[PDB]
Amino acid sequence: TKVAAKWNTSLISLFTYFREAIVATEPLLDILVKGETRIQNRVKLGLNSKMPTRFPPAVFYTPKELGGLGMISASHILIPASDLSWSKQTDTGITHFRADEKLIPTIFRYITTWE
RNA sequence: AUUUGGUCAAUUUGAAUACAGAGAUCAGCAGUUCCCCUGCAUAAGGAUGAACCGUU
């Protein structure tokens, strides 16, 4: 959680400051991509010695308060349709839901350009 | 393109039993040190009071 928070701080610091300029500088973008991945992998490593095929993004990007890590993504992350299903136990029965495409929203859209 | 990072311990053994592993929480009081006040003692050191004359 702490690590995630730190990452968020770093990312926010980068963006809130260089707002408009990050979109141009490709190297920085690449680093961000990779950095995020690295961060994710640390957590993965902690969880298990074997690295997973794929975690759900849920565990990372879901907020601190819901019980996630609350990473603030800087990448084209793909929330797989499989990882959006859910169920509900009721008196009537067990109503389900399953699943365009869903993408973890990136910090980019949410900081207003300096101009 | 495959794979290692994945062994419960403990006990009974000459695999079975176990099955994660064995005081908590709330509250007093005293002591320790330093400080302040208070009463007493001990030394020291003052300050002062009390009629009226004394002793070979």
From Swiss-Prot:
Q: Per its UniProt entry, which superkingdom is the organism in?
A: Eukaryota
**Compartments where found:** Nucleus
Regarding domains, what does the record say? The MPN (JAB/Mov34) domain has structural similarity with deubiquitinating enzymes, but lacks the residues that would bind the catalytic metal ion. Contains a region with structural similarity to reverse transcriptase, presenting the classical thumb, fingers and palm architecture, but lacks enzyme activity, since the essential metal-binding residues are not conserved.
Quaternary structure and interacting proteins, as annotated: Component of the U4/U6-U5 tri-snRNP complex composed of the U4, U6 and U5 snRNAs and at least PRP3, PRP4, PRP6, PRP8, PRP18, PRP31, PRP38, SNU13, SNU23, SNU66, SNU114, SPP381, SMB1, SMD1, SMD2, SMD3, SMX2, SMX3, LSM2, LSM3, LSM4, LSM5, LSM6, LSM7, LSM8, BRR2 and DIB1.
Extra remark beyond the main annotation: Present with 468 molecules/cell in log phase SD medium.
Q: What does this protein do?
A: Functions as a scaffold that mediates the ordered assembly of spliceosomal proteins and snRNAs. Required for association of BRR2 with the spliceosomal U5 snRNP, and the subsequent assembly of the U4/U6-U5 tri-snRNP complex. Functions as a scaffold that positions spliceosomal U2, U5 and U6 snRNAs at splice sites on pre-mRNA substrates, so that splicing can occur. Interacts with both the 5' and the 3' splice site, as well as the branch region. Has a role in branch site-3' splice site selection. Associates with the branch site-3' splice 3'-exon region. Also has a role in cell cycle.
Q: What is this protein called?
A: Pre-mRNA-splicing factor 8
Species this protein is from: Saccharomyces cerevisiae (strain ATCC 204508 / S288c)
Instruction: Kindly list the organism's lineage.
Output: Eukaryota, Fungi, Dikarya, Ascomycota, Saccharomycotina
Q: Which gene encodes it?
A: PRP8
The shown range, given as first to last of full length, is 1329 to 1448 of 2413
